[PDB]
Amino acid sequence: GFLGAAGSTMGAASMTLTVDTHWGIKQLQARVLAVEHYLRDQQLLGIWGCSGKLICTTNVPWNSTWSNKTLSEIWDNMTWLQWDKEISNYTQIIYGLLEESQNQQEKNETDNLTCD
Amino acid sequence: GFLGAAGSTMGAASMTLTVDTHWGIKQLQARVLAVEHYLRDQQLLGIWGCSGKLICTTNVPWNSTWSNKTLSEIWDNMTWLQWDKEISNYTQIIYGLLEESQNQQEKNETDNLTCD
Amino acid sequence: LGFLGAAGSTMGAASMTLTVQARNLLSGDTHWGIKQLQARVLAVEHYLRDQQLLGIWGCSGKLICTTNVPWNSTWSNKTLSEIWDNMTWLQWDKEISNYTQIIYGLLEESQNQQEKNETDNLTCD
Amino acid sequence: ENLWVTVYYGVPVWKDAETTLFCASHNVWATHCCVPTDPNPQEIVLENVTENFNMWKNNMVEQMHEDIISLWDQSLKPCVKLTPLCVTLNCTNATASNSSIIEGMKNCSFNITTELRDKREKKNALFYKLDIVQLDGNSSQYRLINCNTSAITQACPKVSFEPIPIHYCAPAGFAILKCNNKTFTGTGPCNNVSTVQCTHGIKPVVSTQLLLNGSLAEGEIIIRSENITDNGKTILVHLNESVKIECTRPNNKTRTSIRIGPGQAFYATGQVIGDIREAYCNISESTWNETLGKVVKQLRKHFPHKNITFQPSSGGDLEVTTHSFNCGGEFFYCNTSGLFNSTWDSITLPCRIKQIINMWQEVGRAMYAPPIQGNITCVSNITGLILTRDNTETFRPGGGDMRDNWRSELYKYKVVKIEPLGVAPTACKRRVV
Amino acid sequence: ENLWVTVYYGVPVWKDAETTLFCASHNVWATHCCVPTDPNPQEIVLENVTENFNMWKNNMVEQMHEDIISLWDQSLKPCVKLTPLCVTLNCTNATASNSSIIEGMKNCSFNITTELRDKREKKNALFYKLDIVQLDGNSSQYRLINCNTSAITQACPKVSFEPIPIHYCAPAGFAILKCNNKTFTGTGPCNNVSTVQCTHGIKPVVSTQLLLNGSLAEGEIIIRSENITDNGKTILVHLNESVKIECTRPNNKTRTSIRIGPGQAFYATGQVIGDIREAYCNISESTWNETLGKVVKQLRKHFPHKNITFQPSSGGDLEVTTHSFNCGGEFFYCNTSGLFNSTWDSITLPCRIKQIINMWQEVGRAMYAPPIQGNITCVSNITGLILTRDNTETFRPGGGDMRDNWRSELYKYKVVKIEPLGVAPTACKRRVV
Amino acid sequence: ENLWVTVYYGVPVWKDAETTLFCASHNVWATHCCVPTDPNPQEIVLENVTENFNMWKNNMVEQMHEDIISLWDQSLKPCVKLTPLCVTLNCTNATASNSSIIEGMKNCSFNITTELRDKREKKNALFYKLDIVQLDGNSSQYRLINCNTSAITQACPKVSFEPIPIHYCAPAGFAILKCNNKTFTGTGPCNNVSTVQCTHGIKPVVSTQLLLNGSLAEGEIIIRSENITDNGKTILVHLNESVKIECTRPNNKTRTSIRIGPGQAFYATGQVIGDIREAYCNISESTWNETLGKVVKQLRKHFPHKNITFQPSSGGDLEVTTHSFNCGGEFFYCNTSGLFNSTWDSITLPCRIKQIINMWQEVGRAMYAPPIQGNITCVSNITGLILTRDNTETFRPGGGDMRDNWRSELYKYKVVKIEPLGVAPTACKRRVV
Amino acid sequence: XXXXXXXXXXXXXXXXXXXXXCXXXXXXXXXXXXXWXXXXXXXXXXXXXXXXXXXXXXXXXXXXXXXXXXXXXXXXXXXXXXXXXXXXXXXXXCXXXXXXXXXXXXXXXXXXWXXXXXXXXXX
Amino acid sequence: XXXXXXXXXXXXXXXXXXXCXXXXXXXXXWXXXXXXXXXXXXXXXXXXXXXXXXXXXXXXXXXXXXXXXXXXXXXXXXXXXXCXXXXXXXXXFXXXXXXXX
Ligand SMILES: *[C@@H]1O[C@H](CO)[C@@H](O[C@@H]2O[C@H](CO)[C@@H](O[C@@H]3O[C@H](CO)[C@@H](O)[C@H](O)[C@H]3NC(C)=O)[C@H](O)[C@H]2NC(C)=O)[C@H](O)[C@H]1NC(C)=O
Ligand SMILES: *[C@@H]1O[C@H](CO)[C@@H](O[C@@H]2O[C@H](CO)[C@@H](O[C@@H]3O[C@H](CO)[C@@H](O)[C@H](O)[C@@H]3O)[C@H](O)[C@H]2NC(C)=O)[C@H](O)[C@H]1NC(C)=O
Ligand SMILES: *[C@@H]1O[C@H](CO)[C@@H](O)[C@H](O)[C@H]1NC(C)=O
Ligand SMILES: *[C@@H]1O[C@H](CO)[C@@H](O)[C@H](O)[C@H]1NC(C)=O
Ligand SMILES: *[C@@H]1O[C@H](CO)[C@@H](O)[C@H](O)[C@H]1NC(C)=O
């Protein structure tokens, strides 16, 4: 269910993407933290132009240095846990590129040229 | 004018649809809960496919089980408050169905991804 | 380039840093604990108030959007080649500071009309 | 096939709810309930809306009670305790100005430490009989009342406790509904409902028998009760006309000071110059008699074709038998037995003063009210009674809960939660194909 | 070009994390942990998932330790602090029956200040020697073991400390992974991992040496050491059969209530009516002997030499040398030397009773356990032994601090954070219209 | 024309603001500022941005002041109370080795309650006479100076108050701007501005007339004032070169420990052996002369009149007229008159020691500084002076509100609120979409 | 088993010293606690004890005239009083009385009464 | 030491109880001189019913309070029930009931 297919390959696992004072302070910290995490993820999908989607594609190409593997092995012979570890050192690079692409698209949409 | 223009036809909604220690704990709880309530409604609208919308048309039909009244009885009454009470016991059915409908739409789109 | 990097750059040039500014709005023993929770809750409230304000005029989900509200010259009788070029956002904010919430009331009204005109009228189409 | 669901957001729907409301408005109330009010708040009217109000199930009164306790607790906490004064007291009925005996304000001597822990000396102070407990039969030795089994702390002389009007305001997501039916009882539906973000201001006035300084009823006298018939229920009487009550403590009091500990001191009563009556209250006869006749005209609609009698309360301690006033630390406990004596140009009620008070019935923490120098004159507007029942029926001006003093103004307000989501039938499917 | 970045949300990936767990659910337990748990909790098996667990580094244990202390202190805070009892005591011979001297008791008399500050009264109570220290020597003057360090808070007389199971629950965004390997043994990779939101429910039992009322091993006895080879670690032997233990205090303590202040009283033993033995516990002999034999059978797998010796605990405070536990509110310190004495119908162990308790050490605080009227019997499950190690190996019923009691139950759980976002290459570039 | 409104989010603009700042890293400062610092601080230069700074209206100093008072007060709460010491003292002349007269200290005998409510013990301790008040004329009876005022508490020996750099950090949604103009001089536009996440780290060093251990001016000596003409304000002179100051207490102090009450302990001076001059500070003469000369030359740019004279403080409270500081945990009050007597190898300042301190000028609390054993030396860096202006013109060491010693470090920082939303016109219209 | 004899200062003179003892069969003289329970005519008995501890306890009612006395080798509980008045008539009973011991840790229950005797000390 | 008395006045052939209220009472127990010249214990171990006490007997020592009750309802139950405790010194033995019922 919740983490169902966690040990399955990434391709297979795509099927589950659709799935008193001190006490007071701990409860407030837990609630505030949950909100902050929610908003950070929504903000990030928003800034990349993936708002409301589980599957989102972009205009950023995958770099040849980001594991240098083929799709026929990546999706079929690896799990998401393994994949996340395999490319973890490119996390910020990819996120930055996604933000740049989306911002450029938005700028193109309001150009004085075309648009009208 | 919160809850102003109460009563009249359902269509009366128009466009009115526009929105120290112990003390510190009470105030933090009040603010945090206001945020949580806001976000839960936004999450619920999101799961049903409503994002940035006041009004959404869905693919869930009415059951005679929920209401055997016609379209000339509902809306045309100068209220909604009693009506919401009349079908309050089906709220969770309609809401569950709205989620199922969106899940089917998401699945249909997922498997028929438009690619450049 | 960085948070407020290029703040002195032109209005146009600065549009390429919108993505940076947007990410620095959210964060990563007793009375003190309260001071910190209050600060965190308030930062969240500010974030959400701005998202609701942006959303109320139909711009949810975008850093840049347009509307149906015309630019009245009483607001700023300068052309695009004059403001987007030799002027910063800080200067501009001062230049039109008087219309704070004037523009927003207008944005809310135009969106209200846009939504009204899509409600019942030509709906289910 | 033509019946489909449409989702709507922001529809004016509300439900009964319980939440925390906040206050809006040199004294404690201003210090805590320091948030400003919206000037010229806009009230709106809900056309063709009927709603149910129930003043005896209205949790705002419970909230108000809790906040009052909370404020007094915070306010009294950082002040001088009187534990060091619970020593044997050597008392005689000596007077300061009376060539004879005043039968009160006894002169008590005792051995107390000073600013130094190794120095103890005899001090003198005067005390009210109501504050003093005899240690044995025919004994000259006494203790302070409420020392045995309980703590005594001085009221903070530095800050007042004034009945400033306070408005209660809704948090986001909530609204306060108000009943605008002038003859509404608080027992059912109201067919004229308005909505506000804040209630009108209510002065946190404390009384025990008679209701003071509230609003007046519009229209005729309104008799409100959870039941009316049941002898176990209080019937609040809300007058449409006020009656002036003028109370005084005519004597000139002075003070002395007993230092207790490194930076602390006790405010003690010293010499008193003046008359024999400690206190009394001025009530006019014509107004009182008319007021009761008016109350009776209305009681007769609940209790028709019978005679009624007003009698003095049945008993108990002062907090439930006399009319309590807060005119400063010189708290008044006035005898109204001569007021509630009738069957269906002015009078004076004798009144006593007490300094050690178990306010709110929190008997484990008594407050000592410091004396006030000079004389006191205070007036108030009576707005009602907390009168209780039991051919002929008897009406007794008995005591009641402190919450009974707030229900009388909060009865017209209700808190509801805004519930913006709902659905409605239409005849369309989603336009995504 | 091919190989485009695709963003996915809802990805089943987690990372190790430390967060605040919810305690969830007149008794102190659940006085604040008042949130009902899921009546139908689910468990999800993760196929093909192997995770690394380490009970010795489990943050859940550390967090529980803090919750236990915090609840305890909050519970004791709102009641009388026993400060007026730092007095010189007479503590004379406590006698009984046919001129017998009670070995563990003294009759202590003292001058108490009473609630009225000018009085002093001679009071007396019957006390245990374990709570008393000799002043000087060759003298009748005695003092309590406290005052030397700090004041003792009297346990609040209306609060029960009887343990209930508590289920810890992860906050949204977090999950708890559970290890289901029957022979997992403390640390390392665990296959057959399942996901839960809340733990199975652990009773906050605070005994030492012999763990009481825990979960039972399902398979073979598990040694569960951090490092079996290095003799500097606690060994938590988890038994798969429970040993029945019964504890008795065969006497009725009468009570005397000594007022010590303005609304406060100290409770102390009046007389003891019943047997002379302070307390005792007993374990069936065949059960114990076989159980110990089963444990050595497994120890021999780590220590493959036919000579295992069990000896009694090393010297030190009773809290570490004896079997300390809470029995009906009473505090027992039982001598287990009769159990741990061997080389490889019942056994009765004498028990001591103590009233001034320093739970979890802490040092700066102490609690006074009021005497309990009536006789006390407890029956409990011994579910695991705490051993320390000293070819010809010797083991003793030693132990660590209280964290070890919870390590023995929380060993199968780990907290992780869920990270739903991730990226991977695809064949499809974003379609832009 | 043909332009329409475009709404932008993420616009790099800001407004002046006041918000809550947080602090980043046995030491009280380290314990409180538990949040780690940025190991690699980033800075952004706001090329082509100018901004207005005003050090005298800078809300960061107020917050720093408040955080310090709060931490100080909190640190001292879980410590020994010395209120049991408000007893009569004998305070006779103390003898050190063969010195019968010690001007600064007396040998005070007293009656003190130990852990038991039993006969008090007679104890002796040495006290500085600056903290002792004589109870009457020609009398042997003495009291601690802060009794008959407020509670006196003892700092815990376990906690260090040694200043560590304190980094103030902005919360999300906020930023701190930093002025990089070497000659900014307190107020007005700064034409070279950069942003930081946190401040550089300011040590919270407490002093009066001379500022210690700050950062030196980047350029030449800077004289800062809210208003030069106005003689009612502090002039902060910020030096570009430091002056080395050596402070010593050349005596080996022997400490004792007196148990006070039920578990608490009072630290007191037993004996002092050494060079009974008690304390002094050593300042190079030529360094001071060069420093003064340079300050005056800069002063003359504000004050063109020749022969401006420097004088000693005019009088008043010790905390104002004398140079005070914490040296090794001890509190020094040094005489600076030798530094301010002109119109311009070493010199020394005689210096006194106190133990009871009304720090922050709040009389409601007083800290007793436990005595420190052995001898104390420290060397500090004089980095700026606090001066006030009063015929040519004259100046004296000034006083301050303990904000001045922090304004001198925070003058270059400003807090601003980020405002991401704004509008501008475009050539495009929403159209239909 | 420890049956005991009645005792009184039979034929004592009025306002004269008088004494009595209650021989106990099947008993140690030092049989743990022992006391007199000589309830006066129409009144409660005064406390006394002559326990195995070589006690000699008495109630304040005894003034300085009466005292408990050590039991005989015959295990005869004993007591005596100076100037016994004829007014002080009593049952002169002996007993394993309540409060005959400190009883810090009492068990079960016990009692004994020996037997009553006349004790008028008339003339 | 304190003492208090029942002062008889008990009902015959009815459930009834003797009572005391001595200020210094502690672990007080009852006995009654109902016959001959000795009191039989009614209670022992303070209020616990005495061994061989009437099955219908009960007691309620409660600081300065006591009772010796029985549902036995015997006719002419002239049991001179009385309270005793060591109390402050020596022992306090109240004569308590006289002719009871
Ligand atoms: C349902 O409740 C409503 C809210 O209380 C009532 O509406 C109020 O009526 C008042 C008059 O009865 C208005 O105030 C006064 O109106 C007169 C009109 O002639 C003016 O001259 C007065 O100057 C004005 N008073 C002041 C101080 O200005 C209230 O303003 C009005 N309130 C609102 C919110 O509309 C309804 O009358 C009531 N309906 C029934 C059946 O009782
Ligand atoms: C200004 O800065 C200087 C350092 O640059 C400060 O001097 C330092 O002061 C501390 C506390 O007095 C000294 O710490 C002590 O050291 C001894 C060992 O020598 C140790 O036994 C003590 O427990 C304690 O740790 C430190 O050594 C000393 N540094 C030097 C170089 O001497 C000075 O105190 C600061 N001035 C002000 C006003 O804050
Ligand atoms: C209330 O009824 C009147 C009847 O004339 C109507 O005009 C008004 O619009 C109604 N208002 C609402 C909210 O139903
Ligand atoms: C400042 O102005 C110069 C003018 O040549 C320009 O090159 C530079 O990019 C500007 N700075 C910023 C931040 O845009
Ligand atoms: C331009 O702005 C002014 C502002 O007062 C307004 O009066 C005027 O009508 C506006 N013109 C438009 C909207 O065309």
Ligand SMILES: *[C@@H]1O[C@H](CO)[C@@H](O)[C@H](O)[C@H]1NC(C)=O
């Ligand atoms: C005190 O009595 C005098 C008598 O003339 C009166 O004028 C004054 O108002 C009284 N003051 C108070 C506070 O009662």
Ligand SMILES: *[C@@H]1O[C@H](CO)[C@@H](O)[C@H](O)[C@H]1NC(C)=O
């Ligand atoms: C203080 O007085 C005591 C009196 O016994 C003496 O022993 C002690 O040495 C004196 N201390 C000093 C420093 O003079």
Ligand SMILES: *[C@@H]1O[C@H](CO)[C@@H](O)[C@H](O)[C@H]1NC(C)=O
């Ligand atoms: C207590 O104070 C008296 C004052 O005369 C003095 O004689 C006595 O010695 C002191 N006792 C103690 C314990 O210091």
